[PDB]
């Protein structure tokens, strides 16, 4: 039910260069024209980018990078924010995130995915614990992640992951990376999301 309203915001993303599909992932709308996106992809180069079929050029959107406090230290989240100069409205789902969430073990976990490989998919998983920092093979550091047990191929990055606490269904952040039957999300705080909605509305 809520799960679907998250999907309404999730959109297939891709990165092209010289005509060939170089990369592919997801992005989740949070408000207005703001989309949560895997930062470690805008690092490596792109020519064109497709969001939901829209043939975007480089100069038509702008990216916001955030820092996170991991053990009282300041690192740059792998969850970035792609904002279109002009585009379509997504729902405000920023109201669903939180800030001081410590999720219990074994709890269910859902991963709303929408891309060009699989399509509009959801998956299930189990909550493990908080991981401080995770480093990729090329050095794409991913701080403040959250570990959950589930099957996650490539192109799931950017999808929206939601769990439970009490009677509430909280969105934690966006799926970042994984493999080995385990997955990782860039933990995103509501406070952070609101302080940017102020600056864009």
Author numbering: 7 to 207
What is the paper's account of this structure, in its own sentences?
Cell entry in infected hosts is followed immediately by translation of a large open reading frame in the viral RNA. This yields a polyprotein precursor of over 2,000 amino acids that is processed into fourteen distinct capsid and non-structural proteins for virus replication. The majority of this processing is done by the virus-encoded 3C protease (3Cpro), which cleaves the precursor at ten distinct sites. FMDV 3Cpro may also assist infection by proteolysis of host cell proteins and has RNA-binding activity that is important for initiation of replication of the viral RNA.
We report here the cloning and expression of 3Cpro from four distinct SAT1 and SAT2 viruses and the crystal structure of the 3Cpro from a SAT2 serotype virus (SAT2/GHA/8/91). Accordingly, for each SAT sub-type we generated expression constructs that add a thrombin-cleavable His tag to the N terminus of residues 1-208 of the 213 amino acid 3C protease; following thrombin cleavage there is a single additional Gly residue appended to the N terminus of the protease polypeptide. To ensure the solubility of the SAT-type 3C proteins, we introduced to all constructs a C142A substitution to remove a surface-exposed Cys that had been shown previously to be responsible for protein aggregation. In addition, the active site nucleophile was eliminated from all constructs by incorporation of a C163A substitution to prevent adventitious proteolysis in highly concentrated samples of purified 3Cpro. A complete dataset to 3.2 Å resolution was obtained from crystals of SAT2/G-g3Cpro(1-208). The crystals belong to space-group P32 and have a long c-axis (318.5 Å). The diffraction data were phased by molecular replacement using a search model based on the crystal structure of type A1061 FMDV 3Cpro, which is 80% identical in amino-acid sequence to SAT2/G-g3Cpro(1-208). Model building was done conservatively—amino acid side-chains were truncated to the Cβ atom in cases where there was no indicative electron density.
